[PDB]
Each structure stands twice: as structure tokens, then as C-alpha cells.
């Protein structure tokens with residue numbers, strides 16, 4: 001019956017960079033998954049109150065979504081590509097932990113994770 005604070009997308013005392021690899025994570029990886037027919041459940045934080053999922057955040061202590069990831073990239077929040085790659089991996093893992101194999105939401109996540117993997121495979125070497 002209440003959502004937590006969302007993940008921070010802004011922290012002025014966190015040091016930041018805008019690397020070639022971070023630019024690809026935006027213009028290639030996030031863009032690819034964002035436009036997908038299965039992106040919609042992943043485009044903002046889990047609204048456990050409207051979804052009637054009052055255990056979600058009992059179970060899920062590290063929430064992540066592509067709304068967050070997107071703001072983080074657009075805001076220049078990260079130091080490196082690995083922090084961002086972690087965030088996508090977290091989002092996928094959380095889906096798997098909470099739900100049961102073969103639920104529509106897990107197949108959605110599986111499809112996006114496949115594209116994620118195809119895109120990251122070609123992550124450029126730093127400039």
C-alpha cells in the first residue's frame with residue numbers, strides 16, 4: 001500500500017563522465033529496448049499500489065527500470081559503462097526473482113535481454 005522513493009537519477013556530489021561507451025548505451029542500447037513492443041512494463045518504476053503487488057518491495061530491495069536508466073544516461077549520472085550495464089542486469093534479475101517462469105512479464109524481459117546482449121556484444125572500446 002505504499003511505493004518507496006524511486007532510485008536517484010541526480011546527485012551533484014557523485015562524479016560524472018560522458019564517455020563514448022556511455023553514449024552508445026544511450027543512443028544504441030537504451031534506444032533499442034525503449035522502442036520495443038515489450039518495453040512498456042519497464043519504462044517507469046514498479047507501481048506496486050496500482051498493480052496490487054504489495055509484496056513487490058518486500059522481495060525487491062534493489063529496484064531498477066529503464067525510465068530511471070534513461071534519466072541517468074540523459075542526466076549524465078554515471079562514471080562508467082559498467083554501472084549502467086549493472087542497472088539493466090538488475091532490472092532483468094528483479095523480474096526473474098519476483099515472477100514465475102513463463103509469465104508474460106518474464107517473456108517480455110527475456111526478449112529485451114536478448115537485444116541488450118546483442119547490443120552490448122558490440123560495445124565500443126573507449127576513445
Ligand SMILES: Cc1cccc(CN2CCC(CNC(=O)CCCOc3cc(=O)n(C)c4ccccc34)CC2)c1
Pocket residue numbers: 040041042046049050051052053094095098099105
Ligand atoms: C484490489 C486491487 C487494488 C489495486 C488494483 C487492482 C486491480 N488489479 C488487480 C490485480 C492485477 C494484477 N496484474 C498483474 O498484471 C500483476 C502481474 C505481475 O506484474 C508485473 C511484474 C513485474 O515484475 N513488472 C516489472 C511489471 C511491470 C509492469 C506491469 C506489471 C508487472 C492488477 C491490479 C485491484
